[PDB]
């Protein structure tokens, strides 16, 4: 139950090229781009705990 | 209701996929109420006659308004020993034949009432076909942002109808003018005079004559011209929306588009159907770069 | 503040789908809304003519 | 009132008139002055 | 023999067969609003 | 020589000076030449003339359509005797296809041809409906057809139910089609003027066995020729349509040629000057 | 469930169930509603015809400063018309 | 199952249309016999083309 | 192709010049063949059949240059008016020399504008505007001041 | 109706005033400024 | 997901020729069955087996 | 309708002429198309035929028959695909661009069958890319740079030596099995010849325009004899713009 995720970053960089996102078109291409390839190399990757992945009451630094 | 329902989408959809004209809401639905009332005034006189439908031999006689209201039951004393449940079936079937009968001239009737409609329309249908500028190409040719590619197969196989005339405009106007002319030749010459005093001219003076109408007695008392609603050529319901507010120019625009694209689809699916029961396409798809490859 | 079923409206549907008339007026008077007398008493108390 | 203020086929229009009409008689709308720089302003900030 | 399929295809008479015709809508939904219509035209007449 | 043309001539001179004219007539050309029906009846009209091959008939098809030939007048009334011929001695054919007015007998008044238009007669030789006839636009092909019905229906003479009057190839002249210059060359069958018609129709082979048919006797004698006139003309009208046709555009050419070359070189010389300058 | 307090809204509905009998509930013999494009159809003109073409239906210079009808926008217009065009545009 | 023959009766149930429709003349002209006349069973396969 | 192969035999020389040429006092309003001539080039359109006459008269040795060497079974290049409408969608695109059934006018002039080779009117003098051209580019408009 | 009437007579007088002023019976596209911008003495006439 | 060999067939396409050439065109049940008799009798070498 | 139309057929209008035989044969044939469209489905490898931007049903103009031009698309051009797809599946080269298998099988035998498929697939590609369908003229700034080399005191002598040039470096290619393009050195133009299975990104050159000497090209139409006419007409249907394009982005 894994698909393959090119479809879901054309998608993600279409959405915000043709919402008006970014003052600059590139920016939000590059930006999402460049924040996946960092997290790449991450022990457990793609998991996050519950609570810290999303805006709650107790955050990270 | 829904064979008209459908041809005015047909027409509403056209015009404003064609030329920019909108057709009003108000003027839409009242072709429509004039189909319906077309079709009760049928019913109010179909009902002031009856159907006869009858079972074995002449046993079992009954009496229908042709709308299906059932109104005598004629026995013979041969039916009254049967059974209550093959008493039940003779008259019912008796009352399917009436049902029968009446349903044949109701669907007459009908077809009458579809041409009536269809000569309704002509003026707003023609009206958008038989401008300067009307065109179309083939369906199955390829259409890119600039404009509309050439099919290859076949160069004999693509003929371009005209409808109309290239050099100066003739107009059903015209034509109709035409006709009063030529009615107005023939009443003035002598043969046309004779011929005046036949019964064959009293009854045309008496069912073409306008013009002898009493005052007060009913129907058109002048002959009339042919309407003209010649479509890029009159702004309808658009300039009054695009002047007063915005918001519902674009949902009206919004509305002949979704309209026109439906219809578009509808003929898409006959043609699909036409072409599985000859044969020429399978039953699911087969082939995938031919929607895939876009 | 009743909940009725899905299907409540059967018996009167099929009721209207089978029904038949002898001409239209018949069909659609005004007031086939009533049936006994309580209605026609309802439905004329305004008019102290009627 | 808020649609002539932003002059909207703008780019289009330019082009238009710069490719097919000759110099002497043409009329170039500048996007610069126009209320946006001529364009759709960023997600967020425009108030709507 | 063969007559008698030539027999078969000729309408339902209930002389021979003693059977009405089937005709198929209209048994189903007039089949029990029958007696309705029926009483509403005042019963059957019997004649002779 | 700038007096004498041909159709093809004029139909390429005409090309320069009317676009949408030139146009049209090809249009309709095309049109005429898609029609199976008036192929068939060309086709089974001149068939018994030549008797033979339906490869000349054929060719002689499409030679006519675009006014590199016409009929020579003898042919022609030997073409109608033919008809008649054909049309009397089985009925079942002809009168399924070419259509004569039948007379009503619910309908009986006093008069000498009413009578004969009355009981078990043909009335009058009938045009075919305007779906299966020469070209017609579409803007106007509805209220053309309500027209021609309105009118038959209450036996209304005129207009697009009356046939007008083809012309021929004279017996003296070979010419094989329709010149500009030369009216003598084509010869109409006119009421008053007859072409022999009759001396032509007595003097057949075939006069006793059309002379037995009751139904033609009122086609023949009733108004005299002007019965056998109105026939013949209506016969290659509704048959070979576009003899008139072609006929109306020579006339048409040559009655607007020379306002159009005034045009012509009035702004030419404009421009030329205009240039020059 | 259905609330006792919607049920007004299926009462056209009912209704028409109920007024459908005979004429009302007949559809055209033959016709669907559904008229498939069969050939193709363009009365496009080249413009020096169109130039002429309405002059006896309404006046003469129909097409004058139409620019979707007209591929030559200027034709037919008189001098001073002509030169509001670059008026504005200066 | 269309069948019948086989019990000594006509087959019922309207089937006899479909298996008539000018179109499965088309696509298999004889099938209309095969399975009104010999009890054959037909499947998914066939009922979709 | 049609408009290629003219462009190219035209060459400079005034179109004003060759439509009175082409035709002698007698032969079509001018008027006409302009418009006609105008709509064809640019905006582009099928050519009526009085362009497709003159042109025809006028091209026929580079339009049979162009069919001199064409096998049997591929597409030739004829003006032929013998069948009455001018869509090229109808010919099979073999009448002029078009690919397509239809442009839609602005997005063609555009096109063929974006050609250099579409003549500027150059009312300036002519030396100094080809100079300007040269040592600017085109690049002079990328500035709005 | 009537309005119509008037409007129509009013045009067709105004169009043949612009398109040919003097009446020679061709058709003009290069109007005096006096035709283009001068008011109909008609309707002045009519007040009167 | 879907193949023309995965769906469940009876007249898989020889059948289907089999069955025009057996039952298509015959008017009568008797004609049907000499025209089968006189099929059952081929041999195994011939073309039309 | 699309979809369910196979893949040759074209849909069009009921004339109502087809007795019944042809209409049963012609639903055979397409449960035949079905059947073998079914199997081309799985068989699909990685690389694949390009879609045509003009269509081909009719002949290419001035150049082509149908049937010409069909015989390279659908049997010689569709099997160097299918050994190319066969060849790359197994190795280190799968699923990579076109390129890194050109380039990464280039000079060398052992990978020698893949890398001839790949450049034979390329040249086939960029030969369609280079016909456009009636021809179009050689565009002003590519005429001069043309100019500068070739031009011989005359006006836009360029396009007729290099039309000229062109035919005599395919004359002089005698295999009559290979590809002469017309090439950007990034210092100059030339016109190479490359022999079959072998392509300018190879050599690392930058194409601008194709031309097939594949015998197997010229053969139904022009004959044994007939390649200079070929490549006359070739002049009459190329694409100049593209090679224009492709020149000024090799420059900058
Ligand atoms: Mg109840």
Redesign the interface.
Known sequence: GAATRLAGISAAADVMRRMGLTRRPMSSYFELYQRIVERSEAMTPWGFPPLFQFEERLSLE | MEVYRRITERVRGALWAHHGRLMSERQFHRILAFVYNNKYEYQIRFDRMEVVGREWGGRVEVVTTPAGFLKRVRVNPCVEDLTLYQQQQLILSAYANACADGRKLMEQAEMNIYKQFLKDLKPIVMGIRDNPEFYTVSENSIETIGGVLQTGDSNNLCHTHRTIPAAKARQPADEVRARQEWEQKWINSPRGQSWALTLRGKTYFALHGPQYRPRGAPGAKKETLPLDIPAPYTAMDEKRLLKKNWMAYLDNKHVAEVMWTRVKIADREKRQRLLQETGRAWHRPINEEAINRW | ITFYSDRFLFRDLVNRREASYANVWEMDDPYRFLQTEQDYEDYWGDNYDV | SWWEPLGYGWEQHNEEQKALCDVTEQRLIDGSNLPFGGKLPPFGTSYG | DDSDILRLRAPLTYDMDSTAALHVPTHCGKASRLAGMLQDAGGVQVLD | QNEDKMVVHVL?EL??????????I???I?ENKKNRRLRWEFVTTLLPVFGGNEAKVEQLYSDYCDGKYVPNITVAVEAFIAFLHNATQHPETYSASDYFDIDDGK?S?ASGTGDQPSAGQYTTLKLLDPLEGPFV????K???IQ?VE??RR??????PVMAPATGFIAANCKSLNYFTRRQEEVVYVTNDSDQGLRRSLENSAYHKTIAANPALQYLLKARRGAALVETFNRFFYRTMPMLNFYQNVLKHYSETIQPL?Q???S??????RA?ES | KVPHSLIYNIYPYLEEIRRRKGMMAMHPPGKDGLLMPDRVVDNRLPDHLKRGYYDDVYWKDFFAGSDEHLNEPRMGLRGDEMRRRLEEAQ | IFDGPNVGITPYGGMTRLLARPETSLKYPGLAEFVVLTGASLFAGDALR | ALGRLFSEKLGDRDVHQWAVESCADGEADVRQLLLSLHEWRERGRPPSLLLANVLSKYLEEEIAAFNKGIPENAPKLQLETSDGTLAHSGSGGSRSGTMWADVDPTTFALHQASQSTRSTRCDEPFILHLVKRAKLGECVTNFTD | EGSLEYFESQYRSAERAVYDEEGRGVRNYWPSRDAVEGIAQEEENDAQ | SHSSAMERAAITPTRARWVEDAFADQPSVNDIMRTLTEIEQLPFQSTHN | YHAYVPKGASVQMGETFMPSNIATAVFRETEAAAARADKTKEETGFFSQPRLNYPVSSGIPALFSKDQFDMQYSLFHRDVVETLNRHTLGTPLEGHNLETVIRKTSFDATQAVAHTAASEHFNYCFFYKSLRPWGTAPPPRLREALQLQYGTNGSADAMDEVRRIVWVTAASHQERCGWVYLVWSGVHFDVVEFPHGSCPIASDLIPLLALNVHESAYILDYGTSGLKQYVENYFKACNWPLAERYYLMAIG
Request: proline content about 0%; hydrophobic content about 35%.
């Open positions: 390429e090309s320069l000076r009317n676009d949408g004219l030139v146009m049209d090809q249009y309709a095309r309908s008044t636009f579409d803007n106007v509805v209220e053309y027209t309105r009118f209450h036996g209304i003479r005129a207009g070359r045009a012509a070189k702004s030419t010389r404009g421009l030329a240039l």
